[model samples]
Target: GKKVEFNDKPKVRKIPSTRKIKITFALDATFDSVLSKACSEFEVDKDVTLDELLDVVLDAVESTLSPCKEHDVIGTKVCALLDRLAGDYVYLFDEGGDEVIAPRMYCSFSAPDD
Candidate 1:
């Protein structure tokens, strides 16, 4: 037996009355110098998810880039941002362990591509 629920996406009837705010994150020598201008324009929230953080960084780089041109530049920028933000801290969950094999297999089959 199973229970299922379905709901439509919510609609926004009007824009909210809110003040425009901006936060600048300076790209120092810690990051690649080429991304300096791009990194500076991010509107980063204090507490953000990995994707949200990546988005701000992507937007900065995308602004100056053209859609018709090489997309690699944009991807490269995103990679750089991730590296500075979380790459070093990422640890692969002991993939070689027996206990992880089945669950990892399920994840590999069911999860969206990162």
Candidate 2:
């Protein structure tokens, strides 16, 4: 005799700090612009040394955006931020695999609804 089981629901955590994931990505032209601007806000402080400044400046970005990843895990606020800026668009990859994902299944709606 043998038994097998599979969990249907997504196995995620509430604590953002506890659920860190990593991946590679490339941003669209306009989206990249805003991110670059936000990242530039880090200033060279008088209290901070030149040696640390170089590393800090570089890390500040990697600190906030560590090489980008799946957008779903980018946090709610960030979703609104980017969506409000350039808005929403589907991508090639998704949460669990290489194919796309969506909240609702594909269905045809009445062309003329009252």
Candidate 3:
């Protein structure tokens, strides 16, 4: 038997959906209560990033509220949450025995009005 070689082109994939959806932001017990109380829903893409999330919130609310500075270290709370929703990271527990989940930058998405 002889081995056969074949040439093939990489397939281009299309995004499933880009339409903006309703997203609500909230925080867990670790974060400040003020931040959680000031949270509200907004329109955003399903693939929104951490930076973009900050931007939308700043636009809608006061400037003093923020998740993390632009130059802050990587893998911060905000970054982790964003990556989690993007399917980049796995859920785990913190040193304090608390779950290292989307506590600081949690969000829920839903389809727009019919």
What are the lDDT scores of the predictions, listed in order?
0.38, 0.36, 0.42
Where does model 2 exceed 4 Å of error?
1-35, 67-114
Model 2: how far residue 53 lies from native, Å: 1.6
**Candidate 1 CA-lDDT value:** 0.38
Worst 10 residues of 2 by lDDT: 105-114
Record all residue pairs in model 1 with backbone atoms less than 3 Å apart, i.e. clashing: none
Evaluate candidate 3 by giving its C-alpha RMSD to the native, one decimal. 16.9
Better of 1 and 2 by lDDT: 1
Which should have the higher TM-score, number 1 or number 3?
A: 1
Each candidate structure's count of clashing pairs: 0, 0, 0
TM-score (all chains, Cα) for each model: 0.29, 0.25, 0.26
Span of ten consecutive residues with least summed lDDT in model 3: 105-114
Better of 1 and 3 by lDDT: 3
Q: Write the per-residue lDDT of candidate 2 for residues 1-113, one digit (tens) a residue.
A: 32233233332412222212222122554335534654533333334432343344335544666535445545443554455335332232333332322222121111112
Tens-digit lDDT track of model 3 for 1-114:
423432232224233343333334434453344354455334445665545665555444344335454536522645555664465432223233343223343333322221
Q: After superposition, how far is residue 35 of candidate 1 from its true place, in Å?
A: 1.2
What's the residue-level lDDT of 95 in candidate 3? 33
Clashing residue pairs, candidate 3? none
Name the weakest run of 10 consecutive residues (lDDT summed) in model 1. Answer: 101-110
Model 1 Cα lDDT, one tens digit per residue, 1-114: 322432232123322232112233334453345356445433334344434544554555556442413456445545554564553422112235322211232111112333
